[PDB]
Design a protein around this ligand. Structure first.
Ligand SMILES: [Cl-]
Length: 190
């Protein structure tokens, strides 16, 4: 859309904005996803969405070996921007996320609700030019939807415990939990 210098400077400024927002909101309670009973036999969260109907997501597509990390949206956004501007998985600014070609399709799925919760994104910690970043196996557009709608905290899926703990370290609001253990807890309690 513009030149490289433009795109790098813009990303830089947004990261700096996030740095400050994160520093200000530090320690304050965020709105958490809520594990809810549902018509299926799966883990489903209700996600509050500011000035918007509730969203619902599910870990139905996860492996027993996967781990869930509840992430601070702003921190996740920042780590994604740390991928840089040229990556094929480069993160658009929030204001530009709805322009993404898959975004209407994502918005449509999110519109349905508890009858069809959106499966979690599969992400991974990584290293880019000597710094921490997050990249994707899948779920980039649904991640944009959540970010652009200012969902405060949402779950994501990670391939293994160490990767999950690393994600939680940099962008998490709590320790990870293995999908198999969460499914079993939901079973025994709900
Ligand atoms: Cl599930």
């Amino acid at each position: 859309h513009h030149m490289l210098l433009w795109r790098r400077c813009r990303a830089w400024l947004e990261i700096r904005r996030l740095d400050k927002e994160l520093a200000q909101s530090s320690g304050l309670p965020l709105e958490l996803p809520q594990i809810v009973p549902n018509a299926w036999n799966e883990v489903v969260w209700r996600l509050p969405v500011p000035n918007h109907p509730d969203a619902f997501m599910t870990a139905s597509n996860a492996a027993q070996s996967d781990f869930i990390v509840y992430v601070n949206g702003l921190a996740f956004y920042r780590a994604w921007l740390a991928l840089g501007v040229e990556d094929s998985q480069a993160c658009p600014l929030k204001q530009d996320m709805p322009k993404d070609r898959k975004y209407p399709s994502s918005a449509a799925h999110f519109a349905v609700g508890i009858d069809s919760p959106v499966p979690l994104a599969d992400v991974s910690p990584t290293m880019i030019l000597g710094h921490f970043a997050v990249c994707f196996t899948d779920g980039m557009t649904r991640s944009m939807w959540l970010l652009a709608h200012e969902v405060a905290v949402f779950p994501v899926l990670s391939r293994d415990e160490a990767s999950a703990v690393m994600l939680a370290e940099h962008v998490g609001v709590a320790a990870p939990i293995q999908v198999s253990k969460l499914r079993e807890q939901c079973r025994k309690i709900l």
